[PDB]
């Protein structure tokens, strides 16, 4: 299709790589930041897979819902990872009035 | 159609849809079809048409 | 060969995208119908669902009804006589209007 | 559209280059036939001169 | 992009026709060279026959 596609889009590739690296760093070092919604976004398949792989370092993160156009196998992997870290539903202690 | 079959399988796996075990189709048992042993069948048993 | 190659190269993407979207929409409709509990066994389920066309639907329904109305009455005739077919019936069948083969 | 525009520009440039190369190449048979035409014209002129001179000489004799 | 593609296609078609007809006109240089060679050779043979007839008749009348 494009003999010089990489030559022309090296800048876009570099920017996407930088954004993905920042996302990975934030996910790994976010002890409190554990809920992320990257849905409805044009996140490339490679970038989404990189983010999912980086998630494994930080198990504190309890939620991340990413774009729907990510590969479906990776989507299932992300669902499994999020299920592995879903916070326990704290049973609301019903105060017995007296 | 090939891509959509992949998509359907992946969606089934995604939604934890236990794939209902498809009953193994009745084996094509080699029923007692008495192949008519015409004269010379044994003599031509395994002979290529060119031969 | 040249025209098939050209059509494959050119017209492929648009129809591919449109019909893949259509298949995904049918899959979503089936999932909504069955409350996302089971998915289609194979992609042929969409074709089975959309086999019939309106005019062809009516024509085939009429033909099937005409053919099948006789079968229901065949369960009762059990012990009637086995009379041989008449010569007149055979003669009529053989010498009737020589329809368009 | 970016891809199509780039590909069309490349195709146009390549076709122009090939046409220019072929135009530069083709000059040989033209030169050879030019030489042949010149030689034939020279022969024509020589034979016309022969006709004139020989006719004049014979007319003087007669 | 439809307008761009249509304009580029028209330009490419016009330039292709021009280059093809110019290469054909180089081959036409060759062909008209052959035509001129044929015409000049016909004239050469006509002038040779004129020379021969003139010389023979003049020698006879001498």
Instruction: Please state the φ and ψ torsions of residue A62, each to the nearest 5 degrees.
Output: -105, 0
C20, B12: Cβ pair inside 8 Å? no
Report the relative pairing of strands A35-38 and A63-66 from DSSP bridges: parallel
Phi, psi of A87 (to 5 degrees): -60, 145
Residue A5's closest CA among E1, D3, C9? D3
Angle at A80 between CA A75 and CA A81, to 5 degrees: 95
Q: Which residues of chain B have a CB within 8 Å of the CB of A73?
A: 10
* Beta carbons within 10 angstroms of residue D47's beta carbon: 19
Inspect the interface and report whether the beta carbons of D6 and A1 lie closer than 8 Å.
no
A touches B, CB cut-off 8 Å, minimum 3 pairs: yes
Q: C45 at the B interface (CB within 8 A)? A: no
Long-range CB contacts for residues A81-90, cutoff 8 Å, separation at least 24: A81/A52, A81/A55, A81/A56, A84/A59, A85/A34, A85/A59, A85/A60, A85/A61, A86/A62, A87/A62
Which residue, C31, B14, C25, C41, is CA-closest to A73?
B14
Q: What is the distance between the alpha carbons of residues A38 and A19, in angstroms, rounded to a whole number?
A: 13
Question: What's chain A's length in residues?
Answer: 98
Residues of B whose CB is below 8 A from C36: 15
Chain A residue numbers touching B11 (CB-CB < 8 A): 72
* Cα E30 from Cα E44, distance rounded (Å): 21
CA-based nearest residue to C25, from A18, E16, B4: B4
* CA–CA dist B1, C42 (Å, integer): 10
In chain D, which residue's Cα lies nearest the Cα of E27?
D30
Interface probe for D, chosen from E22, E39, E47 (most Cβ of D below 10 Å), is: E47
Contacts of C41 in chain B (CB under 8 A): 22
**Do the beta carbons of residue A67 and residue A37 sit within 8 Å?**
no
Selected for mutation to probe chain C from B8, B13, B20, B23 (highest C CB count within 10 Å) is B8
- Are the beta carbons of A2 and D6 separated by less than 8 Å? yes
Whether A51 contacts A27, CB under 8 Å: yes
Q: How far is CA A66 from CA A22, B15, D2, D21, D59, in A?
A: 16, 17, 29, 55, 113
Q: How far apart are CA A55 and CA A39, in angstroms?
A: 16
A7 and chain B in contact, CB less than 8 A: no
Residue C7 touches partner B, C-beta closer than 8 Å = no
Which one of B3, B5, B15 has the shortest CB-CB distance to C42? B5
Please judge whether A76 and B14 are an interchain contact, meaning their C-beta atoms are less than 8 angstroms apart.
Answer: yes
Name the packing angle between helices A5-29 and A45-55 (round to 10°): 20
Shortest Cα distance, chain E CAs vs residue D22, angstroms: 8
Q: State how far the Cα of A78 lies from the Cα of A81, in Å rounded to an integer.
A: 5
Q: How many CB pairs under 8 A join A and D?
A: 8
Chains B and C touch (3+ CB pairs under 8 A): yes
d(CA D61, CA D20): 63
| Cβ–Cβ below 8 Å for C31 and B11 | yes
Half-sphere exposure of C37 (CA within 13 A, CB side): 3
Provide CB contacts within 8 A for E40, sequence distance 6+. Answer: D37, D40, D41, D43, D44
Look at the alpha carbons of A56, A68, C41, C20 in this order and tell me if their dihedral is positive or negative: negative
Contact B10 A76 (CB under 8 A): yes
Candidates D7, D11, D22, D26: best to mutate against E (most CBs of E within 10 A) is D26
Say how many C-beta atoms besides its own lie within 10 A of residue B15's C-beta: 14
Q: Which two tokens stand for residue A15?
A: 């920017």
Q: What does the angle CA A20 – CA A25 – CA A27 come to, to the nearest 5 degrees?
A: 95
| Cβ-based contacts of C25 with chain B (< 8 Å) | none
Selected residue of D1, D3, D4 to mutate for chain A interface (largest A Cβ count, 10 A): D3
**How many residues comprise chain C?**
101
- CA neighbor of E40 nearest in space, from D38, D53, D32, D35: D38
């Amino acid at each position: 299709a494009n003999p010089n596609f990489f030559e022309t889009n090296k800048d876009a590739i570099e920017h996407n790589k930088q954004i993905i690296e920042n996302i990975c760093e934030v996910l790994k070092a976010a002890d409190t930041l554990l809920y992320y919604d990257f849905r409805f976004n044009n996140i490339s398949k490679t970038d989404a897979k990189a983010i999912i792989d980086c998630l494994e370092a930080n198990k504190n993160i309890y939620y991340m819902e990413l774009s729907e156009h990510i590969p479906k196998d990776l989507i299932e992997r992300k669902k499994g990872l999020m299920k592995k870290r879903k916070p326990k539903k704290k049973k609301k202690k019903k105060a017995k009035k007296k | 159609d090939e891509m959509i079959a992949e998509e359907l399988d992946i969606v089934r796996l995604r939604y934890d849809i236990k794939k209902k075990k498809q009953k193994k189709p009745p084996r094509p048992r080699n029923k007692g079809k008495n192949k008519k042993k015409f004269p010379g069948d044994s003599s031509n048993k395994g002979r290529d048409p060119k031969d | 060969e040249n025209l098939k190659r050209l059509v494959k190269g050119n017209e492929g993407p648009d129809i591919l995208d449109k019909m893949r979207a259509e298949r995904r929409e049918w899959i979503m409709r089936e999932l909504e119908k069955n409350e996302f509990k089971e998915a289609p066994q194979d992609p042929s389920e969409f074709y089975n669902q959309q086999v019939m066309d309106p005019e062809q639907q009516a024509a085939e329904a009429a033909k099937a009804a005409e053919e099948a109305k006789k079968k229901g009455a065949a369960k009762k005739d059990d012990k009637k006589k086995k009379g041989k077919p008449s010569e007149l019936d055979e003669f009529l069948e053989n010498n009737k209007p020589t329809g368009p083969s | 559209f970016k891809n199509e525009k780039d590909r069309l520009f490349s195709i146009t440039s390549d076709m122009t280059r090939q046409y220019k190369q072929m135009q530069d190449e083709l000059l040989n048979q033209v030169n050879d036939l030019n030489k042949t035409v010149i030689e034939k014209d020279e022969e024509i002129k020589k034979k016309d001169q022969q006709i004139q001179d020989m006719t004049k000489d014979y007319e003087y004799k007669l």
